Write an enzyme that holds these catalytic residues in place. Structure first.
Site, short mmCIF file in Angstrom:
data_model
loop_
_atom_site.label_atom_id
_atom_site.label_comp_id
_atom_site.label_asym_id
_atom_site.label_seq_id
_atom_site.Cartn_x
_atom_site.Cartn_y
_atom_site.Cartn_z
N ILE A 294 -15.57 -5.01 -39.65
CA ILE A 294 -14.15 -5.33 -39.71
C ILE A 294 -13.58 -5.27 -41.12
CG2 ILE A 294 -14.36 -6.77 -37.66
CD1 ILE A 294 -14.38 -9.18 -39.21
N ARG B 101 -14.48 -3.95 -45.61
CA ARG B 101 -15.36 -3.71 -46.75
C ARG B 101 -14.51 -3.83 -48.00
NH1 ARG B 101 -18.91 0.03 -50.13
NH2 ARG B 101 -20.71 -0.84 -48.98
N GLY B 102 -14.90 -4.72 -48.91
CA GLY B 102 -14.25 -4.87 -50.18
C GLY B 102 -15.11 -4.41 -51.34
N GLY C 110 -18.05 -7.65 -50.79
CA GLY C 110 -18.59 -8.00 -49.48
C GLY C 110 -18.42 -6.89 -48.46
N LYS D 25 -19.84 -12.18 -43.79
CA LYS D 25 -19.67 -11.34 -44.97
C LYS D 25 -20.99 -11.27 -45.72
CE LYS D 25 -16.19 -11.56 -47.98
NZ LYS D 25 -15.33 -12.16 -49.06
N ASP E 21 -5.39 -13.48 -57.16
CA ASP E 21 -5.65 -12.15 -56.64
C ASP E 21 -5.03 -11.98 -55.25
OD1 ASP E 21 -6.83 -9.47 -56.92
OD2 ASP E 21 -8.30 -10.17 -55.41
#
Ligand SMILES: Nc1ncnc2c1ncn2[C@@H]1O[C@H](COP(=O)(O)OP(=O)(O)NP(=O)(O)O)[C@@H](O)[C@H]1O
Ligand SMILES: [Mg+2]
EC number: 2.7.11.24
Lengths: 13, 355
Positions: free
Chosen positions: B32, B34-35, B38, B55, B152
Site C-alpha cells: 500500500i 513505499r517511501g 519504509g 511498515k 514534513d
C-alpha cells in the site's frame, strides 16, 4: 457532524 | 510463508522484499505504499481479526540519523492520543536482540492518502477541502500543544479513509519546539518546505507547518502542486512568482548576507492577486490560502487563528479541539545517543508490546 457539509465518500482503489 | 525461528516468526515474500513478522500476522498481504525509509504492507492480525498496516524499515540502525528518525517516529506516535494522529498498534520484537537490523511498525490501517486522492479521477468539492483542512489543523493544534513541530507535512503523509477521516502520519522528521536546529534531512519532496527551511534558518517556529498546510490546501483546490521546483533555486522562484518577491522587512528573519543575496539574485516579481490566480473558487478558501502562503513567517496566520477563519466556521467547535496536556520531553539530542543504545531503546519499546 451535520448533513449540511458531510462530504461524499471517496472512491478508492 | 516460511516459518522460522521455531515457528515464532514467518517470512513472506512481497514483490521481492522479505517481510519477517510474528506469526499472528497472516495474508492477504497488500502493498500500500513505499517511501524513502519504509515499505508498507497491509496484513491481517489473526489474533484480533483486524487489518493492519505493517511498515518495514530496512537497515534502521546503519547510522545515527536513520536511527533517530526511527526513534522519533515511535516515541512521538506512542505519545500522541488523538483522532487526527495515526496510532501505533504494535512494534515487532526482533527474533534475536543480537541481530536487530529491520524495524517493523504496525499501524492502524487507512484506505489511502491525500496525494492519491488529489491525483485521482474524482471530484474534490469545497466540502472535501474544508473537511480535510479542518482535520489537518485540528491534529496540528494537538501536536503543537505537545511542543512538537511536524516539519514534513505533505499530501502523502495525510492518511485518509473513504469517509474522509484524516490522520497525520510520518513523524520521523519532527522536532520539539526547543531543539530547533539548522540541518534539514533529505526528503524526496522539497515542494512543501517553508522558505525558512529552503534558506537554512536555524531558528524557526510553528510557522513552517502552516506553510506546508497552505501548499496542501492550494493543491487540494488546483489538483496540482503549487511549487514543484526541480531544484531549490527553482523552488524559491516559483514561490515568488506567486506571492511576489519579498521586500526588506519580509527578509528580516534571514541571518546572512549570503542568504540575502541568494534571494535577491532571483528575478523580481510582483505579488500576484490571489483571486486572479485562483478564480471560480471559494472566497473563504482563497483568503485563507493567502494568509498561510506569506513569505515572512512572523506574518503567517497561526494554527489557532486558522481554526477561527470563516472558511472553517462550519466545522469549528472549541469543545472538539483538545490540546495535549502532557508535553513531550524526550531529548533526541543527548550526546550519549549512539546507533547501539537507540537500538536498545527501540528493542525495549517492542518488549512493551511483546514481553
Ligand atoms: N497506516 C497506514 N495506512 C495506510 N497507508 C499507509 C499507512 N502508513 C503509510 N501508508 C502509505 O505508505 C506510504 C509510506 O508512508 P510513510 O510513513 O510516509 O513512509 P516513510 O518512508 O516512513 N516516510 P517518507 O519517506 O517521508 O514517505 C505513504 O505514501 C502512505 O500512503
Ligand atoms: Mg517515519
Amino acid at each position: 457532524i451535520h448533513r449540511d457539509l458531510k462530504p461524499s465518500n471517496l472512491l478508492i482503489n | 510463508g516460511v516459518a522460522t525461528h521455531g515457528g515464532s516468526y514467518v517470512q513472506y515474500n512481497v514483490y521481492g522484499n522479505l517481510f519477517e513478522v510474528s506469526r499472528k500476522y497472516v495474508p492477504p498481504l497488500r502493498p500500500i505504499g513505499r517511501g524513502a525509509y519504509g515499505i508498507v504492507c497491509a496484513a491481517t492480525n489473526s489474533e484480533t481479526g483486524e487489518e493492519v498496516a505493517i511498515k518495514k524499515i530496512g537497515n534502521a540502525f546503519d547510522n545515527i540519523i536513520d536511527a533517530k528518525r526511527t526513534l522519533r517516529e515511535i516515541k512521538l506516535l506512542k505519545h500522541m492520543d488523538h483522532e487526527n494522529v495515526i496510532a501505533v498498534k504494535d512494534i515487532i520484537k526482533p527474533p534475536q536482540r543480537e541481530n536487530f537490523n529491520d524495524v517493523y511498525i504496525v499501524y492502524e490501517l487507512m484506505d489511502t492518502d491525500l496525494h492519491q486522492i488529489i491525483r485521482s479521477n474524482q471530484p474534490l468539492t469545497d466540502d472535501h477541502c474544508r473537511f480535510f483542512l479542518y482535520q489537518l489543523l485540528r491534529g496540528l493544534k494537538y501536536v503543537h500543544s505537545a511542543n512538537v513541530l511536524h516539519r514534513d507535512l505533505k499530501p502523502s503523509n495525510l492518511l485518509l479513509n473513504a469517509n474522509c477521516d484524516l490522520k497525520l502520519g510520518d513523524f520521523g522528521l519532527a522536532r520539539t519546539k526547543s531543539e530547533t536546529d539548522f540541518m534539514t534531512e533529505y526528503v524526496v519532496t522539497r515542494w512543501y518546505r517553508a522558505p525558512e527551511l529552503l534558506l537554512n534558518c536555524s531558528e524557526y517556529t510553528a510557522a513552517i507547518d502552516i506553510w506546508s498546510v497552505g501548499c496542501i490546501l492550494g493543491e487540494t483546490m488546483t489538483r496540482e502542486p503549487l511549487f514543484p521546483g526541480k531544484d531549490y533555486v527553482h523552488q524559491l522562484r516559483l514561490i515568488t512568482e506567486l506571492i511576489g518577491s519579498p521586500d526588506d522587512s519580509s527578509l528580516g528573519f534571514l541571518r546572512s548576507d549570503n542568504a540575502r543575496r541568494y534571494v535577491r539574485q532571483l528575478p523580481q516579481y510582483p505579488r500576484q492577486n490571489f483571486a486572479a490566480r485562483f478564480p471560480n473558487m471559494s472566497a473563504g478558501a482563497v483568503d485563507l490560502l493567502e494568509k498561510m502562503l506569506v513569505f515572512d513567517p512572523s506574518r503567517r496566520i497561526t494554527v489557532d487563528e486558522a481554526l477561527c477563519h470563516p472558511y472553517l466556521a462550519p466545522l469549528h467547535d472549541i469543545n472538539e479541539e483538545p490540546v495535549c496536556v502532557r508535553p513531550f520531553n524526550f531529548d533526541f539530542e543527548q550526546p550519549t545517543l549512539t546507533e547501539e543504545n537507540i537500538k536498545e531503546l527501540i528493542y525495549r519499546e517492542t518488549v512493551k508490546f511483546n514481553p
